[PDB]
Amino acid sequence: RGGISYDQLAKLSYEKTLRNLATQTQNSSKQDKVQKDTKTGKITIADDDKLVNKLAVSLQSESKKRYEARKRQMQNAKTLYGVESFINDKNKQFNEKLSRES
Amino acid sequence: ADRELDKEGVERAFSILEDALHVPTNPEILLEKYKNGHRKIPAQTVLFNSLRIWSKYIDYLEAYCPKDANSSDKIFNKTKMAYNTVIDLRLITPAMAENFALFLQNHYEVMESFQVYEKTIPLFPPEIQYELWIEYLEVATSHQLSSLSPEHIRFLFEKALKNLCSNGIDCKTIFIAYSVFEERISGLISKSIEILRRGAVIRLQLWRMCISKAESTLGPSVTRELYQECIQKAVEFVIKFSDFESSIGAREILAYGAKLLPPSNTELWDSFEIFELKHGDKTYKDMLKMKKVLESNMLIDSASVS
Amino acid sequence: YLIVEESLNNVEIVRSLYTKWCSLEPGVNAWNSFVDFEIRQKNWNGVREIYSKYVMAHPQMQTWLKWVRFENRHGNTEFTRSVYSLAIDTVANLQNLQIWSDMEVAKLVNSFAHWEAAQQEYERSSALYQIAIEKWPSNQLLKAGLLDFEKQFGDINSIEETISYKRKMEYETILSNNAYDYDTWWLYLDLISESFPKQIMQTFEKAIVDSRKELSKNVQWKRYIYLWMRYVELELENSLLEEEFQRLIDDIIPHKHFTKIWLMYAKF
């Protein structure tokens, strides 16, 4: 059982982003360089304007999904438990922590 | 296939169905690229995978082969390569693995049917291997053409019996098949330590009890060791078995009645045991009444504890 | 750094990343993601170069056998046995290093041999078993892993040649462990009298009678008596019958030279 170490979870989330990237390329199929400077050591990479937008939109959308998943988890966490007496949300929050320790 | 089998020969029925079953170069890549392909890659390429296609292809071959095939014939060489290709494609169901080993044993290829059990057991998970090990160990000991050495049959049990009880199955029959055959070929009562292992694996009471009957035929020195080891609801049943052994060959039995009644609640069956031990004599209803007196006092002590 | 350059479809930059990142010897999660990259890029010549380095970063069988599951996925027979030849030579020449265990080398020999059986060349699959057991006489699992192939793919006398040796070792290690289990003695002698007739056949009958005092014991010496008698014999009979015999020696003197050896064994 156990938790998942930060090497494995880095790999698994790496694979999940690969699978999602592959399904984006599959969906784009269904719906149808390097220059180094001479003056400086600075390096220039030619990019399409697409796939930079697509990466930025994906990172925002993944952030939205995780934000709303935790927000709905906030909604469930303050609506489920009502047995023990508390004082505020932070009391029930900390006493959920003592229930997790058991 | 079915319309052509009636109108035309079975050789015509093979030939239209041979075109289905070309295993091209690599089934692992084509199976995976089909599964990962989102409905674009046709199933024309991965048509070999389908079990239904293979079974009714084979059932035409096994029906068309003569009753005496003896491996000279083309068709018996053809159905064996078509059967072995199913095992190499690894799409073989365990009822289909029996139908091929049965197939070779009718056509006197018995010693190659032990290869058939050998290849497939590795591939299957236990709870299914138990049904193949029955059919494999039974051909080894019962079929008349199989001339296997008694150290080779003992290998087939204690490779299985150790492997199959390791994953954890009751294994009531295999113990008995390694128990029954030991007299028909070797003929000594090593049977007990071969069958003691059924009683003490790491149903079981029904393996322990029939054999402790068997050494009372041979010799009482190896009975009395079991009577000790038999007792170490289910615990109460073991105590009853020990009392029966004492009757066959009385104070140790009564003290055992105490040991069993003290093993566990209810104890009336144990009272039936001691009463049986008393009844067995052809001495004075004094020790018996004293026994019931001791049992009643113990019950009163249990009531006081409660 | 990868999935961003994946998302830009800059395949030359992740390849230059991977080459640097696998140069630092990072671990098995990295190379496996790097062989999974070149599968995505279809560069079959490039991914074969990776496993060349990957076995030299992680020398162990599940990295060698990962490279054989790569090749046997593709069915290229000429490359696959070349991987197989390199894998078994490397265990042989780097034997003194002691970095592959007895269970670990059994997997290479079996996965070499079961591959060759699928390539219909049983004689090479049989021949490497004899070389591997002579090169490693120490590992029993290679000797055991050499039995299950013959059960699958060899002819019945060759199994019976090999099944006798495993029964020989297992009966020997129980009798060394368990002192007096006389029912296994009556099979161990008959394992040797049936399938091992040799100088060992007489020697074990000496070694069994060495271990031979119970009623369960003395009948085994009667078996070794008859094993010697069927084939000196009077000499061992008088040494054994010295356990005690005044009536026996009077019975001996009346019916030893008068009558036979069978009459002489009748006193015992």
In DSSP notation, B105-122 reads HHTT-HHHHHHHHHHHGG
Nearest-10 crossing angle of helices C28-41, C44-54: 170
What are the Cα distances from residue B15, in Å, to B57, B87, C89?
10, 22, 46
Interface B-C: count of C-beta contacts within 8 A: 44
Q: CB burial class (10 A; 0-12, 13-18, 19+) of residue B173?
A: middle
Q: How big, in percent rounded to 5, are the helix, strand and coil portions of chain B? A: 70, 0, 30
Are C189 and C205 in contact by the 8 Å Cβ rule? The answer is yes
| Distance in angstroms (rounded) separating the CA atoms of residues C65 and C59 | 11
The token pair that represents C42 in the structure block: 């279809």
| Distance in angstroms (rounded) separating the CA atoms of residues C246 and C266 | 16
| Distance in angstroms (rounded) separating the CA atoms of residues C256 and C263 | 7
| Cβ-defined contact of C6 to A52 (cutoff 8 Å) | no
Looking at residue A52, the DSSP 8-state letter turns out to be T
Strand partners, A44: A35
| Distance in angstroms (rounded) separating the CA atoms of residues B11 and B5 | 9
Residue type for position C81: R
* Interface membership of A47 toward C (CB under 8 Å): yes
| Distance in angstroms (rounded) separating the CA atoms of residues B76 and B17 | 17
All residues of chain B having their beta carbon less than 8 Å from the beta carbon of residue C110 are none
**For residues B195, B201, B207 and B211, what is the CA-based torsion angle, rounded to 10 degrees?**
30
Chain C, nearest residue to A48 by Cα:
C8
Chain A, residues 18-37, CB within 8 A of chain C, namely 18, 21, 34
Looking at CA atoms only, how far is residue A31 from chain C in angstroms? 19
All residues of chain A having their beta carbon less than 8 Å from the beta carbon of residue C7 are 21, 51, 54-55, 58
Chain C, nearest residue to B154 by Cα:
C167
Strand partners, A35: A44
Chain B, residues 70-109, CB within 8 A of chain C, namely 88
* Interface membership of B28 toward C (CB under 8 Å): yes
| Distance in angstroms (rounded) separating the CA atoms of residues C80 and C73 | 10
Name which of A11, A16, A18 to mutate to probe chain C: the one with the most chain C Cβ atoms within 10 A of its Cβ. Answer: A18
Listed residue (C3, C85, C6) closest to C41, CA to CA: C6
Chain A, nearest residue to C9 by Cα:
A51
What are the Cα distances from residue C213, in Å, to A35, A92, B192, C174?
94, 78, 22, 19
All residues of chain C having their beta carbon less than 8 Å from the beta carbon of residue B119 are 152
| Distance in angstroms (rounded) separating the CA atoms of residues A20 and B84 | 40
Listed residue (B157, B155, B144) closest to B108, CA to CA: B144
Note every long-range contact of B173-179, with CB atoms under 8 Å and residues 24 or more positions apart, other chains counting. Answer: B173/B134, B174/B130, B174/B133, B174/B134, B174/B137, B175/B207, B176/B207, B177/B137, B177/B138, B177/B141, B178/B154, B179/B211
Chain B, nearest residue to C181 by Cα:
B190
Chain C, nearest residue to B117 by Cα:
C152
Nearest-10 crossing angle of helices B110-120, B129-142: 160
* Interface membership of A95 toward C (CB under 8 Å): no
The 3-state DSSP class for residue B169 equals coil
| Distance in angstroms (rounded) separating the CA atoms of residues B129 and B164 | 8
| Distance in angstroms (rounded) separating the CA atoms of residues B33 and B30 | 5
The 3-state DSSP class for residue A43 equals strand
| Cβ-defined contact of B118 to C151 (cutoff 8 Å) | yes
All residues of chain C having their beta carbon less than 8 Å from the beta carbon of residue A7 are 27, 29
Q: Identify each DSSP E strand in chain B by its residue range.
A: none
Are B212 and B230 in contact by the 8 Å Cβ rule? The answer is yes
Chain B, residues 222-261, CB within 8 A of chain C, namely none
Looking at CA atoms only, how far is residue A47 from chain C in angstroms? 8
The token pair that represents C29 in the structure block: 């999660």
All residues of chain B having their beta carbon less than 8 Å from the beta carbon of residue C118 are 88
| Distance in angstroms (rounded) separating the CA atoms of residues B166 and C246 | 57
CB atoms within 10 A of CB C167: 23
Residue type for position C146: L
State the SS3 of chain C.
Answer: CHHHHHHCCCHHHHHHHHHHHCCCCCCHHHHHHHHHHHHHHCCHHHHHHHHHHHCCCCCCHHHHHHHHHHHHHHCCHHHHHHHHHHHHHHHHHCHHHCCCCHHHHHHHHHHHHHHHHHCCCHHHHHHHHHHHHHHCCCCHHHHHCCHHHHHHHCCHHHHHHHHHHHHHHHHHHHHHHCCCCHHHHHHHHHHHHHHCCCHHHHHHHHHHHHHCCCHHHHHHHHHHHHHHHHCCHHHHHHHHHHHCCHHHHHHHCCCCCCCCHHHHHHHC
Looking at CA atoms only, how far is residue A16 from chain C in angstroms? 10
| Half-sphere exposure for C38 (CA within 13 Å, toward CB) | 19
Q: CB burial class (10 A; 0-12, 13-18, 19+) of residue C241?
A: middle
Looking at residue B49, the DSSP 8-state letter turns out to be G
| Distance in angstroms (rounded) separating the CA atoms of residues B271 and B275 | 6
All residues of chain A having their beta carbon less than 8 Å from the beta carbon of residue C39 are none
DSSP string covering B58-125: HHHHHHHS-S--TTTSHHHHHHHHHHHHHHHHT---HHHHHHHHHHHHHTT-HHHHHHHHHHHGGGSP
Number of domains within chain A: 1
| Half-sphere exposure for B276 (CA within 13 Å, toward CB) | 17
Write the CB contacts of C88 (distance below 8 Å, at least 6 apart in sequence): C108, C109, C112, C128, C132
Task: Check residue B53 and give left, alpha or beta (phi > 0: left; psi -120 to 50: alpha).
Answer: alpha
Are C141 and C150 in contact by the 8 Å Cβ rule? The answer is no
All residues of chain C having their beta carbon less than 8 Å from the beta carbon of residue B89 are none
| Cβ-defined contact of B28 to C72 (cutoff 8 Å) | yes
Q: Indicate the residue of C7, C29, C40 with minimum beta-carbon distance to A55.
A: C7
| Cβ-defined contact of C3 to A14 (cutoff 8 Å) | yes
Write the CB contacts of C236 (distance below 8 Å, at least 6 apart in sequence): C209, C225, C228
| Distance in angstroms (rounded) separating the CA atoms of residues C148 and C150 | 6
Of chain B, the end-to-end C-alpha distance in Å amounts to 77
| Distance in angstroms (rounded) separating the CA atoms of residues C212 and C189 | 13
Name which of A6, A7, A36 to mutate to probe chain C: the one with the most chain C Cβ atoms within 10 A of its Cβ. Answer: A7
Q: What domain range is A35 assigned to?
A: 1-102
Task: Check residue A86 and give left, alpha or beta (phi > 0: left; psi -120 to 50: alpha).
Answer: beta
For B189, phi and psi rounded to 5 degrees?
-85, 65
Chains linked to B by 3 or more Cβ pairs within 8 Å = C
